[PDB]
């Protein structure tokens, strides 16, 4: 119970894979952020410098890092695919 496969690709490509692991049911603020960045190997905190965009369905769309796990603290939707791009 309580499972969702998380990706993120803070390098451009619109298709180059990078993270999605399943985690057991929780993680996304810096600490998700480093697990897909800091691993590979590219930028670092969705900060300024570059900007993230979690996209989930209907109206449910995160931006920015510090995003506390939002999403299971009232429920959940679908799987969870974030991708990050640089920027200013």
Known sequence: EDTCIIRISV??????????????????????????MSKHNLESDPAEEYELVQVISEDKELVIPDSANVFYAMNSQVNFDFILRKKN
């Open 11 to 36: 390098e451009d490509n619109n298709g180059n894979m990078y993270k999605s692991i399943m985690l057991t049911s929780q993680d996304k603020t810096p600490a998700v952020i480093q697990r897909a």
